[PDB]
Amino acid sequence: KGLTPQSQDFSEWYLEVIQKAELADYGPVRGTIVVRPYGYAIWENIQQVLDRMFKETGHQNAYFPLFIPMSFLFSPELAVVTHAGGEELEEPLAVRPTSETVIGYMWSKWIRSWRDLPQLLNQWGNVVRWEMRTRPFLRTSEFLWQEGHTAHATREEAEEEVRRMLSIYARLAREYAAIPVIEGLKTEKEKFAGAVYTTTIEALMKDGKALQAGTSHYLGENFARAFDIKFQDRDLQVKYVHTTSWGLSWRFIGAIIMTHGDDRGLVLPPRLAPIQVVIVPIYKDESRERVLEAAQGLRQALLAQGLRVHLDDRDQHTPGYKFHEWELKGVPFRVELGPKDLEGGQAVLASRLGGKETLPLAALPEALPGKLDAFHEELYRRALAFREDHTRKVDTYEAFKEAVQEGFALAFHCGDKACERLIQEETTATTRCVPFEAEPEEGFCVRCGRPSAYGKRVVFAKAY
Amino acid sequence: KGLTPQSQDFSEWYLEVIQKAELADYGPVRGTIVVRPYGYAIWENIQQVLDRMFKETGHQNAYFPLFIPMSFLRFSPELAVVTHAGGEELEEPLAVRPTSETVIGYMWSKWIRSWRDLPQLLNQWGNVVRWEMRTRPFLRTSEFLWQEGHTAHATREEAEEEVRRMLSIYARLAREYAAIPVIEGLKTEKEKFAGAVYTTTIEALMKDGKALQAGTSHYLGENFARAFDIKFQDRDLQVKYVHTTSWGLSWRFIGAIIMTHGDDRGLVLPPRLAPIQVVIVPIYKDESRERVLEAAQGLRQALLAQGLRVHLDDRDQHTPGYKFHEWELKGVPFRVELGPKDLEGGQAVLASRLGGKETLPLAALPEALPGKLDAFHEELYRRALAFREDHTRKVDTYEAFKEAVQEGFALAFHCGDKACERLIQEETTATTRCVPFEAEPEEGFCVRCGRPSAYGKRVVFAKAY
RNA sequence: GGAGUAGCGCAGCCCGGUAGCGCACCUCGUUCGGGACGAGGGGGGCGCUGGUUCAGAUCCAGUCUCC
Ligand SMILES: Nc1ncnc2c1ncn2[C@@H]1O[C@H](COP(=O)(O)OP(=O)(O)OP(=O)(O)O)[C@@H](O)[C@H]1O
Ligand SMILES: Nc1ncnc2c1ncn2[C@@H]1O[C@H](COP(=O)(O)OP(=O)(O)OP(=O)(O)O)[C@@H](O)[C@H]1O
Ligand SMILES: [Zn+2]
Numbered sequence: 002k003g004l005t006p007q008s009q010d011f012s013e014w015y016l017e018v019i020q021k022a023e024l025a026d027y028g029p030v031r032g033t034i035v036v037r038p039y040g041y042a043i044w045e046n047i048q049q050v051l052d053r054m055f056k057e058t059g060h061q062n063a064y065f066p067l068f069i070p071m072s073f074l075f076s077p078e079l080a081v082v083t084h085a086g087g088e089e090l091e092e093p094l095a096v097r098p099t100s101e102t103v104i105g106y107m108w109s110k111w112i113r114s115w116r117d118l119p120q121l122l123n124q125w126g127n128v129v130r131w132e133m134r135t136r137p138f139l140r141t142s143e144f145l146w147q148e149g150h151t152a153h154a155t156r157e158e159a160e161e162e163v164r165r166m167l168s169i170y171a172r173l174a175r176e177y178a179a180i181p182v183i184e185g186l187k188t189e190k191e192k193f194a195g196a197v198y199t200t201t202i203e204a205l206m207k208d209g210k211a212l213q214a215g216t217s218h219y220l221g222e223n224f225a226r227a228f229d230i231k232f233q234d235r236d237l238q239v240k241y242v243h244t245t246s247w248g249l250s251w252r253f254i255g256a257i258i259m260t261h262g263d264d265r266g267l268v269l270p271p272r273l274a275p276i277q278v279v280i281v282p283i284y285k286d287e288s289r290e291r292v293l294e295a296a297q298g299l300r301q302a303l304l305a306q307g308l309r310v311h312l313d314d315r316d317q318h319t320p321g322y323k324f325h326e327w328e329l330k331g332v333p334f335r336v337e338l339g340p341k342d343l344e345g346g347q348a349v350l351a352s353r354l355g356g357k358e359t360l361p362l363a364a365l366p367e368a369l370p371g372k373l374d375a376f377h378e379e380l381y382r383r384a385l386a387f388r389e390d391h392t393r394k395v396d397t398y399e400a401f402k403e404a405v406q407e408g409f410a411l412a413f414h415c416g417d418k419a420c421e422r423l424i425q426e427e428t429t430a431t432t433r434c435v436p437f438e439a440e441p442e443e444g445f446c447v448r449c450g451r452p453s454a455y456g457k458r459v460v461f462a463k464a465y
Numbered sequence: 466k467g468l469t470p471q472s473q474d475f476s477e478w479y480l481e482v483i484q485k486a487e488l489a490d491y492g493p494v495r496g497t498i499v500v501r502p503y504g505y506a507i508w509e510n511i512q513q514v515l516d517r518m519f520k521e522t523g524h525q526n527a528y529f530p531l532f533i534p535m536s537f538l539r540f541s542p543e544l545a546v547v548t549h550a551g552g553e554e555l556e557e558p559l560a561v562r563p564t565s566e567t568v569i570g571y572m573w574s575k576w577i578r579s580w581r582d583l584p585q586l587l588n589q590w591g592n593v594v595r596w597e598m599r600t601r602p603f604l605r606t607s608e609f610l611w612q613e614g615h616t617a618h619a620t621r622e623e624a625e626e627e628v629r630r631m632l633s634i635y636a637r638l639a640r641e642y643a644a645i646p647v648i649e650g651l652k653t654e655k656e657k658f659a660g661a662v663y664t665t666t667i668e669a670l671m672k673d674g675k676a677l678q679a680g681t682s683h684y685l686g687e688n689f690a691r692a693f694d695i696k697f698q699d700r701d702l703q704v705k706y707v708h709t710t711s712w713g714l715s716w717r718f719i720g721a722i723i724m725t726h727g728d729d730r731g732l733v734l735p736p737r738l739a740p741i742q743v744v745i746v747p748i749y750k751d752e753s754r755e756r757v758l759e760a761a762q763g764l765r766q767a768l769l770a771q772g773l774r775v776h777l778d779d780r781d782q783h784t785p786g787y788k789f790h791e792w793e794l795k796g797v798p799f800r801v802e803l804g805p806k807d808l809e810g811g812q813a814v815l816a817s818r819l820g821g822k823e824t825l826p827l828a829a830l831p832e833a834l835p836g837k838l839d840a841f842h843e844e845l846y847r848r849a850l851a852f853r854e855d856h857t858r859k860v861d862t863y864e865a866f867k868e869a870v871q872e873g874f875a876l877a878f879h880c881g882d883k884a885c886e887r888l889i890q891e892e893t894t895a896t897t898r899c900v901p902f903e904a905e906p907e908e909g910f911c912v913r914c915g916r917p918s919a920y921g922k923r924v925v926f927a928k929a930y
Numbered sequence: 931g932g933a934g935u936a937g938c939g940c941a942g943c944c945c946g947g948u949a950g951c952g953c954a955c956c957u958c959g960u961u962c963g964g965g966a967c968g969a970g971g972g973g974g975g976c977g978c979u980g981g982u983u984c985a986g987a988u989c990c991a992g993u994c995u996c997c
């Protein structure tokens with residue numbers, strides 16, 4: 002057996018690594034998947050981090066209904082309940098594709114004065130956006146995510162919120178997933194329908210395609226107006242609130258897999274990996290007892306350092322087999338504990354990134370955290386390298402067509418949907434975002450030639 | 466203040482306290498609710514506790530699909546059905562999961578091959594839909610959050626041990642965290658889970674006398690294994706079906722918390738699951754608003770340092786007496802009253818939602834609270850116990866029975882026949898709560914039909930939620 | 931033009947005989963420092979619907995499905 006190399010067929014690589022690492026499996030219903038323990042463990046760590054962040058910024062979790070009145074909101078990407086309770090529903094119900102509406106409805110009745118603001122809500126849950134074609138974590142009918150919703154008195158506080166969150170998403174990606182990203186602004190064609198504008202963080206997968214890791218929307222008074230959400234300000238004036246919306250789904254897991262995965266399988270970032278150190282004991286019948294005891298002692302010492310450790314006791318498998326399994330599963334470090342090692346009060350530390358090294362057993366606990374960090378740092382620097390190595394400034398549409406086969410294309414655009422739409426029908430590439438810290442440039446649209454829009458180059462790429 | 470007293474109309478008391486304490490609100494769709502922050506905070510603490518307990522017992526969370534193939538369930542009333550999706554009409558209509566046994570079975574069928582593949586120790590935190598067009602927050606709603614565990618074993622014994630391991634967890638959650646007393650027992654054939662061999666449960670008594678099923682744990686034998694073809698080759702070369710179990714606890718547990726300890730002043734939350742354990746209320750006047758608030762702010766840090774979940778109520782817009790009532794309504798166990806005066810004397814007033822009032826040095830507080838919170842929990846539980854005892858009654862005649870099922874628990878003898886049981890329910894509207902595990906050995910005659918007593922002990926009866 | 935046969939990958943159909951092989955899985959022993967070895971085993975009735983036949987993955991007719 003093996004594993005289709007990325008260069009041969011990335012899509013297959015992806016699908017197989019997901020299956021073999023037991024991250025997920027396919028559900029009986031088309032477009033639906035089953036997230037197995039190891040994969041779900043990753044999602045939990047993401048929840049934990051984001052949740053802490055959201056909390057430190059005054060948000061509070063709540064839980065709104067799965068079912069939304071159709072009238073609020075048959076659209077294609079919508080699953081509809083029509084039968085329920087045996088009889089046929091008066092009005093057909095939609096399975097939430099997002100929660101803005103229902104929350105708006107409730108906000109309408111909860112918000113009265115400026116004392117009811119700001120509204121800082123977050124909800125962890127599932128949503129359904131129909132798709133009969135499957136692709137684990139990247140595009141599925143049902144999927145888990147976190148969707149935040151806030152309501153403000155002023156348009157300024159709202160926008161500061163929109164940014165605050167995108168930065169959180171970015172911190173999650175950079176300091177925890179070691180996934181580099183571009184903080185930017187979607188174009189009119191690419192933004193959220195009901196939003197005024199949409200901010201996003203874009204990542205580059207090892208296959209060159211781009212991925213939207215998370216979005217943060219400024220909704221202005223669209224929903225306030227649509228759902229009548231007003232309040233009496235301090236100046237005794239009854240005005241409309243300004244709402245924002247932000248969300249990150251398990252697609253972020255897909256990003257992790259496609260940003261660091263190699264031909265041996267997964268490579269999970271230390272800060273989010275279910276298992277950080279996997280201990281693989283190595284023995285013969287006469288060594289087993291004493292060797293396993295050491296392993297368990299080591300397991301304790303590591304658990305104490307607050308590390309996430311796993312001891313692979315499975316006796317039905319050989320050391321070499323295990324070495325592979327865990328490399329497949331992306332565990333950052335492996336500790337090989339054999340009789341020779343045990344004899345010399347040492348052990349071997351093999352890094353998923355590459356290399357083995359011998360160290361004494363007692364030193365191991367204190368030394369792993371730092372090594373784990375160094376591990377993180379490396380992963381990130383390599384991803385960075387990869388990104389730069391695949392981002393390119395295109396001036397001639399011919400250069401553009403070439404660069405969007407490799408990765409990011411930094412071109413100019415007229416800011417015309419019609420043109421944008423054409424570039425996609427042609428090269429399939431799309432607008433990823435108008436980067437915020439992007440250098441100021443003025444030129445002419447790469448495909449139609451009309452004066453450059455956005456006063457800076459737009460990030461283009463074939464995306465997921 | 467207009468909180469309908471429990472004795473006047475419990476149902477209204479319940480509904481209003483939920484509204485006023487901002488635990489939840491009604492959603493636009495019939496039977497659906499919205500869990501507001503404060504209420505959801507409670508659910509989160511429950512998750513936290515249960516999950517640590519599930520984890521220490523080797524379970525692992527996973528996430529299975531919301532949509533289940535109708536054929537798997539073979540439209541049954543309690544189901545919500547998707548028929549339209551993607552614009553076109555579905556080939557086969559999809560059911561919104563009312564529970565996950567089936568889909569997990571399907572998956573288990575393909576994952577399990579060897580005994581080395583068992584046990585399967587799975588748990589899933591999520592939502593499920595069981596249609597109901599009539600609403601009652603946390604007690605009975607169309608959609609609701611819960612935790613549903615599923616395990617697969619090689620032997621029936623390991624499976625049954627799992628079934629009791631979990632019910633005990635549920636019971637520990639109720640007793641050591643919710644301070645809600647409960648009876649660990651076994652449902653009767655009429656009252657068990659359809660697909661289960663047998664059903665274990667924990668039963669609680671609400672302040673209105675009605676009973677509530679806080680959590681269940683089922684032994685499914687080989688029903689699903691067989692239904693979904695879940696076999697494996699054992700150490701003995703023999704191929705066989707696995708033995709699966711199932712257990713679940715929903716946010717109905719919140720309803721239990723509300724109805725077990727709630728009083729006419731409103732909620733009374735058990736300290737171990739309360740989102741706010743201590744509320745600081747600074748009392749002052751402009752010429753002291755600076756020093757009081759300074760101390761209050763300081764005490765806040767001192768308390769957070771202790772890991773205590775505290776909330777400071779600065780709200781200058783409101784009067785002390787107003788805040789006092791709000792926090793008694795929302796159930797906060799303790800209140801610290803920090804006044805202009807007592808700060809120079811260095812003392813403060815600690816007031817417990819249970820009638821305690823004491824003065825203590827601000828310095829002693831941080832350290833003293835933890836133990837007090839414990840003493841609190843104990844008392845909550847003590848009272849609930851007392852209530853239940855005062856509302857449980859051994860009956861030997863069907864007249865006494867009818868009387869006792871108006872007050873609470875009725876400990877009657879039964880024949881063991883579903884027919885009689887369904888009769889007792891048609892007449893008295895009472896049902897079987899459970900056949901207690903630790904009940905005292907007793908033989909007698911069915912409280913209604915006269916025939917010799919089954920179970921070898923008294924069955925717990927009651928009007929239930 | 932091919933192909934739907936065990937979880938996965940395949941052969942068997944021409945010249946009908948009651949289903950086979952690799953991987954995986956179960957047993958036992960030997961192994962164990964980079965995916966072990968031997969022997970012994972378990973699991974499907976061949977996409978679906980007809981038909982011919984003593985007998986049908988195999989022959990005939992037809993239908994569905996992926997390239
Ligand atoms: N089908 C899907 N499967 C998984 N995650 C998704 C899916 N669609 C969107 N997401 C995630 O949900 C987040 C918020 O949803 P949003 O509506 O902003 O995205 P979207 O426009 O649906 O994205 P795309 O169309 O690129 O999938 C996205 O940033 C992404 O992480
Ligand atoms: N409609 C509901 N709303 C909230 N929680 C519920 C609801 N139905 C059941 N639960 C919770 O889910 C747990 C497991 O559900 P299960 O299918 O065993 O219940 P059930 O037999 O339908 O309940 P009951 O006996 O109360 O009708 C119950 O112990 C309870 O805590
Ligand atoms: Zn153009």
Ligand SMILES: [Zn+2]
Pocket residue numbers: 879880881882885886911912913914915916
């Ligand atoms: Zn009887």
